[PDB]
Amino acid sequence: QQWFCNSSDAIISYSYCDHLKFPISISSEPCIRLRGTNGFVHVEFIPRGNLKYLYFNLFISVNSIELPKRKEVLCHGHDDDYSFCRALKGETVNTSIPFSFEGILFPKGHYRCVAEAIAGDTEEKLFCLNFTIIHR
Amino acid sequence: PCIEVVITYQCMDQKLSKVDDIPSSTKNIDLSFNPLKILKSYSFSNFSELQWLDLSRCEIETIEDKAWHGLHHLSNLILTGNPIQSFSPGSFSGLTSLENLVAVETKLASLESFPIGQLITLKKLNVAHNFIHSCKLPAYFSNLTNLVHVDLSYNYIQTITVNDLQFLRENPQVNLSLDMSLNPIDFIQDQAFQGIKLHELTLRGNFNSSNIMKTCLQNLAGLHVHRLILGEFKDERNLEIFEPSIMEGLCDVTIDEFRLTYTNDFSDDIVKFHCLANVSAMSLAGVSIKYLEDVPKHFKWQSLSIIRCQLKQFPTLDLPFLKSLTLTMNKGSISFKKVALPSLSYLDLSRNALSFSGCCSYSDLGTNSLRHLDLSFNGAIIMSANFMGLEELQHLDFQHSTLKRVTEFSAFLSLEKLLYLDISYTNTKIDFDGIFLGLTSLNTLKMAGNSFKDNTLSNVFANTTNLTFLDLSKCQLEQISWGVFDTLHRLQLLNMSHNNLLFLDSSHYNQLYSLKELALDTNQLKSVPDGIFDRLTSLQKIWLHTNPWDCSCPRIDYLSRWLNKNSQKEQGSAKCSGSGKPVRSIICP
Ligand SMILES: CC(C)(C)OC(=O)[C@H](CCc1ccccc1)NC(=O)c1ccc(N)c(CCc2ccc(O)cc2)c1
Ligand SMILES: CC(C)(C)OC(=O)[C@H](CCc1ccccc1)NC(=O)c1ccc(N)c(CCc2ccc(O)cc2)c1
Ligand SMILES: *[C@@H]1O[C@H](CO)[C@@H](O[C@@H]2O[C@H](CO)[C@@H](O)[C@H](O)[C@H]2NC(C)=O)[C@H](O)[C@H]1NC(C)=O
Ligand SMILES: *[C@@H]1O[C@H](CO)[C@@H](O[C@@H]2O[C@H](CO)[C@@H](O)[C@H](O)[C@H]2NC(C)=O)[C@H](O)[C@H]1NC(C)=O
Ligand SMILES: *[C@@H]1O[C@H](CO)[C@@H](O)[C@H](O)[C@H]1NC(C)=O
Ligand SMILES: *[C@@H]1O[C@H](CO)[C@@H](O)[C@H](O)[C@H]1NC(C)=O
Ligand SMILES: *[C@@H]1O[C@H](CO)[C@@H](O)[C@H](O)[C@H]1NC(C)=O
Ligand SMILES: *[C@@H]1O[C@H](CO)[C@@H](O)[C@H](O)[C@H]1NC(C)=O
Ligand SMILES: *[C@@H]1O[C@H](CO)[C@@H](O)[C@H](O)[C@H]1NC(C)=O
Ligand SMILES: *[C@@H]1O[C@H](CO)[C@@H](O)[C@H](O)[C@H]1NC(C)=O
C-alpha cells in the first residue's frame, strides 16, 4: 500500500498496522538491496508525541517463522545522535537518516516486520508500520 | 598376597622380599616399594608373556646374572631409585624385544659401561637423576638402531665437546632426541655441533648467568634441530636478566620448531628476535608475555601456539603464512580483536575467559579457508553475523561459553559445510525454529545443558537431515512437539536423558531407521505407549533407568516384555517404583 520499491534482489513495501493508522511517510534512496546497501532513509511526519525517548518494538517473522520480540532505542534522552530526537508532539519532522549494512546472509523467501514506535516517556504508540520484504 | 587388577597384578608396598601366586599369563606386574634387595636369577622364568615390570624403589643393590631369564616379551622395565650403581656385564641378558629402559636414580656414573649394547629393540633410554658427568654418546649406540630418545636430565654434565657428539657426526641418518635439562652446562667446544642433527633438543634450567648461556648457544652453531626447547623453572636456578642478544648463537642453528617455556626475566622483544624469523612453528608456554605486537611481516611462522601465558591484549597479527593459531589458558581475561591472517585454517581460542563482540564473519579473521574454530570455555560471545566469508568451516565449538543473540536470527546460515557444532552449556534458551537453518551438512549437534521456550522441543531439525549424533540431555525438556524427528533418517545416537519428560509419543521414533543408541534415562516417565520401540530396527543400546516406572498390570506389559526379549540392549536397569524390581522381570497374567 503506502509505498513500494523493488531493487536488484528485493521487493520492499509497507503499510500501516491494522490497529494503528497514524500517518508517516518513509522512503529509501536507493531501494534496499539485501546484498548490501548504503544510502538514506527519508522520514516525513508529524509525531503524535515527543521523540525525546523514541524506541521501537520489532516483531519479525522470516518465512512465516516468528523471531523473538525486539526492542530498539533511537533516542536515549540525553545528547542523542539525531536531530529529530528534539522534535515535540505536533512539530513537523522532515529528515534524511544515513544508513549502511553489508556482510550478512539473508535467507531466500519473504519476511514480515511490524515496527512499533513508542514514546518512552508516555509509553504511547506514535505509529506502526507493516513492512513486507521479498528476497529473490 | 597381592591385588588382582585384571593379566594385571599390583604388588606395590606389600613388604615382599621376593617376587609366586601369579599366573604365567600375567602381562603387567607392579612390584615397586618392596624391599627386594636382590634380583636373583631364574626369578622371572615363569612369566612367559610379561610385558610391563615396575621395580621402582625396591632397595635393590645387586642384579644377578640371568636375573631376567624367561622374559622374552618384556618391553618396559622400570628400576627408578634402586642403588645398584654398578651394572655387571650381561646385567640385561635375556631382555629381548625391550624398548623402554628406565634407570632413573640408580647411581649410574657413565654410559660407556652401561651393558645395554645388545638391546637392539630399545627405543627410549631414561638415565636421568644419575651421576653421569660426560655427554659422550657411546660407540655401541650403532647397534641400538631403534633408539630415538635419551634422557640425560638432572645429571652433572658440564661440557659438550666435539668427540662427545662423534657418534652422530659419523651417523647423520640417526634420528635422535636428547634431553639435557637440569645439567650445569658452562662450556661447549668450538664446532662441537657442526654436522649434528637432532629431532628434539631440550635445554631447560641449565644456565645461571646470562653470558655463559650466550657463549654456549653460540657454540650450538651447525646444529639441525626439528624442535628446540629453551627455558627455566620456578623452583630452580634462573637468569638474573634475559636479554634477547643471549640468543645470537641461534642464527647459526637451523630450527624448524622453537619452544620457549618459563623464564624469570622476560621482555616481549625476546619472541621477535630476528634469529627466529625462519622458524616454521613458534610456541610459548608459561611465558610472562604481556603483549604481542609488531611481528615482522617477513617471519615465516606457519603455526603459533600460546599456552598459559599472560597476554593483556589480544594479539594484532599480520603473519601472511600463519596457518594455525592457538591461544589457550590465558591468564586473566581479554576481548577479541580483529586479525588479518589470510592463510589461517585452524583457530583455537578456548579457555581464555575471552569476550567476542561481533561473531562472526570474514572481517574478523581475514581468511577464506578457516576450517576449525574453537571458542569454547570462554566468556560472552555476542552473535551479530552469520559467517559470511567463512563457508569452509567444518568444526565449530562454543561449549561453556555464553552465547548471546544466537536465537534471534539464523546465525549459522552460511555454514553449509559444517559437520560438528557444539553449543552445549551456552545458556541458550531456544525460541526460534530457524536457529539451525543452513546446517544441511551437520553430523554432530551437541546442545546439552540448555533449555527451550515452554520446555518444549520445537521443530528445529527440519533441515538438518544428515544428523548422526544429537545430544539434548539436560535441556529441562518436558514435552516434544509433533514431527520434530521426522527428518532424522540417519540419526544414530539420540540422548534425551536428564530431562523432565513425563510422557513419550510413539510417532517421534517411528522414522529413526538408523538409530543405534537411545538414552531416555533419568527422566520422569511412568510408562511408554505400546509399540513405541517397534520400528527402531537398528537399535543396539537403550537407557531407561532412573525413571519411576509404574509396574501395574496390564499397563507395563509391553515394556516388561520388550525389556526381557531385548535384555541385551538395555544399559542399566529400569526398576519398578516402590519395590525397586527390574522391569524386565515383571510378567503380567
Ligand atoms: C530480515 C529483516 C530485513 C526482515 O529484518 C532485519 O534485518 C532486522 C530488522 C531491521 C528493520 C528495522 C525496521 C524496519 C525494517 C527492518 N535487522 C536486524 O535484525 C539487525 C540489525 C542490526 C544488527 N546489528 C543486528 C545484529 C543481530 C541482533 C539480533 C537481535 C537483536 O535483538 C539485536 C541484534 C540485527
Ligand atoms: C541496521 C540497518 C537498519 C541500517 O539495516 C538493517 O537492519 C539490515 C537490513 C535493512 C533492511 C530494512 C528494511 C528492509 C530490508 C532491509 N540488517 C542488518 O544489518 C543485520 C545485521 C546483523 C544480522 N545478524 C542481521 C540478521 C538478519 C536475519 C534475521 C533473521 C534470519 O532468519 C536471518 C537473517 C541483520
Ligand atoms: C624421529 O623420532 C621422533 C620420536 O622421538 C619422531 O617424532 C614423533 O613423531 C610421531 C609422528 O610421526 C608423533 O606421534 C610423536 O609424538 C613424535 N614424538 C616426538 C618426541 O616428537 C619423528 O617423526 C622421527 N623423525 C623421522 C621419522 O624422520
Ligand atoms: C547422555 O547424556 C548424559 C549426561 O549429559 C551422559 O552422562 C555421563 O555418563 C558418563 C558415563 O556414565 C559419566 O561418566 C558422566 O558423569 C555422565 N555425566 C553426567 C552429567 O551425569 C551420558 O553418557 C549420555 N549417554 C550417551 C552419550 O549414550
Ligand atoms: C501485516 O500485514 C499482513 C498482510 O500483509 C497481515 O496478515 C498482518 O496481520 C499485518 N500485521 C499487522 C500488525 O498489522
Ligand atoms: C523535506 O526535505 C527534503 C530534503 O531537503 C525536501 O526536498 C522536501 O521538499 C521537504 N519536504 C517538505 C514538505 O518541506
Ligand atoms: C655391537 O656393536 C659392537 C661395537 O659397536 C660390534 O663390535 C658388534 O659386532 C655389534 N654386535 C653385533 C653386530 O651383533
Ligand atoms: C648459580 O650461579 C652461582 C654464581 O652466580 C653459583 O654459585 C651456583 O653454583 C650456580 N648454581 C648451581 C646450582 O651450581
Ligand atoms: C632466513 O631466510 C632468509 C631467506 O632465505 C635468509 O636471507 C636469512 O639469512 C635467513 N636467516 C635469518 C633471517 O636469520
Ligand atoms: C527446509 O529446506 C527446504 C529445502 O527445499 C525447504 O523447502 C523448506 O521450506 C525448509 N523448511 C522450513 C523453511 O521450515
Give the DSSP letter string of B489-509: TT--EEE--SS------GGGG
Is the distance from CB of B525 to CB of B496 less than 8 angstroms? no
Distance separating alpha carbons of residues B536 and B493, to the nearest angstrom: 12
Tell if the CB–CB gap between A68 and B434 is shorter than 8 Å. Answer: no
Report which ligand 3 atom has the smallest distance to the Cα of B177: 5
The three three-digit cell numbers of residue B434, written as one number: 530457524
**CA dist., res. B8 & res. B49, Å (int):** 12
- Residue A115 sits at φ, ψ, to 5 deg, of -105, 125
Nearest alpha carbon to residue A114 among A15, A48, A2, A3: A15
Q: Do the Cβ atoms of B289 and B314 come closer than 8 Å?
A: no
Q: Which amino acid is at B222?
A: G
Contacts of B231 (CB under 8 A, 6+ apart): B204, B205, B259, B260, B261, B262, B263, B286
**Grid coordinates given for B195:** 654436522
| Grid cell listed for B197 | 642433527
* Separation CA A92–CA A6 (nearest Å): 29
CA B423/CA B445 separation, integer angstroms: 8
Is any atom of ligand 5 closer than 6 Å to the C-beta of A111? no
Helix or strand holding residue B430 (H, E): strand B429-430
How many CB atoms lie under 10 A from the CB of residue B89? 10
Q: Give the C-alpha separation, B302 to B321, whole Å.
A: 6
A68: nearest CA in chain B? B408
What is the DSSP secondary structure assignment for residue B582, as one 8-state letter? Answer: B
Q: How many residues does chain B have?
A: 589
Cα–Cα distance between B376 and B372 in angstroms, integer?
12
Q: Across-strand partners of B288?
A: none
Alpha-carbon span B345 to B347, nearest angstrom: 7
Contacts of B431 in chain A (CB under 8 A): 68
Alpha carbon nearest to ligand 10 atom 5, residue? B463
Q: Which residues in A lie closer than 8 A to residue B434 (C-beta atoms)? A: 62-63, 65, 107
* Whether the Cβ atoms of residue A29 and residue A39 lie closer than 8 Å to each other: yes
Start-to-end C-alpha separation, chain A: 20
B515 Ramachandran zone, left/alpha/beta (phi>0; psi -120 to 50):
beta
Tell me the three cell numbers of residue B256. 624448524
DSSP A47: -
Strand partners, B228: B201, B258
How close does chain A come to B548, measured CA to CA in Å? 36
C-alpha cell at position B158: 658440564
Ligand 2 centre from A47 Cα, in Å? Answer: 25
B203: cell is 635445554
Whether A61 and A48 have beta carbons less than 8 Å apart is answered as no
Give the atom of ligand 3 at the shortest distance from the alpha carbon of B148.
Answer: 5
Containing H/E element for A113? strand A109-119
Breaks (C-N over 2.5 A) in chain A follow: none
Exposure string for B310-323, b = 16+ CB within 10 A, e = fewer: ebeebbebebeebb
**Max Cα separation, chain B?**
94
- Residues B260-282: b if buried by 16+ CB within 10 A, e if exposed: bbbbbebebebbbbebbeebebb
Q: Supply B231's cell numbers.
A: 627455558
- The DSSP 8-state label assigned to residue B17 in this structure reads S
What are the CA-CA distances from residue B414 to residues A112, B83, B339, B407, B436 (Å)?
22, 66, 21, 16, 11
Please enumerate in sequence order all residues whose Cβ is within 8 A of that of A10, keeping only pairs 6 or more positions apart, or say none.
Answer: A31, A32, A33, A34, A133, A134, A135, A136
Residue nearest to atom 2 of ligand 5 (CA): A130
Residues B141 and B115 sit within 8 Å (Cβ to Cβ): no
The SS3 of residue B210 is helix
What is the domain partition of chain A in residue ranges? 1-136
CATH number of the domain located at residue range(s) A1-136 in this protein? 2.60.40.770
**Is residue B236 classed exposed, middle or buried when 0-12, 13-18 and 19+ CB atoms within 10 A define those classes?**
middle
> From CA B196, how far away is CA B135, in angstroms rounded?
14
The alpha carbons of chain A give a radius of gyration, in whole angstroms, of 15
* In contact, B184 and B216? CB cutoff 8 Å: no
H or E segment and range at residue B425 = none
What DSSP state is assigned to residue B133? -
Residues in A touching B361 (Cβ below 8 Å): 103-104
**Is any ligand 1 atom within 6 A of the Cβ of residue B215?**
no
Asked if B472 contacts B448 with a C-beta cutoff of 8 angstroms, the reply is yes
Residue A108: exposure state from Cβ atoms within 10 A (0-12, 13-18, ≥19): exposed
DSSP B139: G
Q: Which amino acid is at A100?
A: S
**Cα(B426)–Cα(B447) distance, integer angstroms:** 8
Resolution stated for this PDB structure, in Å: 2.6
B-side interface with A, Cβ within 8 Å? 361-363, 385-389, 407-410, 413-414, 431-434, 437-438
Using CA atoms, how far apart are residues B14 and B34, in angstroms rounded to an integer? 6
Could you identify the residue written with the cell 650466550?
A: B214
Angle at B28 between CA B26 and CA B32, to 5 degrees: 125
Question: Which helix (DSSP H) or strand (DSSP E) does residue B561 occupy?
Answer: helix B557-565
Backbone angles phi, psi at B413, to 5 degrees: -65, -30
Name the burial class of residue A112, with classes exposed (0-12), middle (13-18) and buried (19+) by CB atoms within 10 angstroms of its CB: middle
C-alpha cell at B364: 574478523
Place of cell 515452554: B454
Q: HSE on the CB side for B286, CA within 13 Å?
A: 14
Closest CA relative to residue B89, chosen from B128, B125, B63: B63
Ligand nearest to the CA of B471: 4
Going through B133-246 in order, the beta strands assigned E by DSSP cover 149-151, 159-160, 177-179, 187-188, 196-204, 223-231
Residue whose C-alpha is closest to residue B471's, from B491, B441, B489:
B491
Distance CA A91, CA A82 (A): 15
Nearest to B28 by CA among B89, B71, B63, B84: B71
DSSP B303-348: EEEEES---SS------TT--EEEEES-SS--B------TT--EEE
> Side chain identity at A4, as an amino acid letter?
F
Could you tell me the distance, in angstroms and rounded to a whole number, from the CA of residue A99 to the centre of ligand 5?
Answer: 26
**From ligand 5's centre to the CA of B423, what distance in Å?**
35
- Comparing alpha-carbon positions, the chain B residue that sits nearest to A69 is B408
CA distances from B271 to A77, B224, B249, B290, B301 (A): 50, 20, 15, 11, 12
Count the neighbouring beta carbons within 10 Å of the beta carbon of residue A98: 8
Closest-CA residue of chain A to B435: A67
- How many angstroms separate the alpha carbon of residue B226 from the centre of ligand 8? 31
Dig out the grid coordinates for B279 from the structure: 622458524
Query: Nearest-CA distance from A90 to chain B in Å?
Result: 35
**What is B1-589's CATH number, 3.80.10.10, 3.90.1170.20, 1.10.287.110, 3.40.50.2000?**
3.80.10.10
Measured at the CA of B513, the angle between CA B512 and CA B518, to 5 degrees, comes to 50
Contact criterion met (CB below 8 Å) for B63 and B92: no
Q: In terms of Cα–Cα distance, which of B252, B279, B256, B258 is closest to B193?
A: B252
Query: In three state form, how does the secondary structure of B461-479 look?
Result: CCCCCCCCEEECCCCCCCE
The shortest CB-CB distance from B361 to any of A63, A65, A103 is to A103
Contact A67 B432 (CB under 8 A): yes
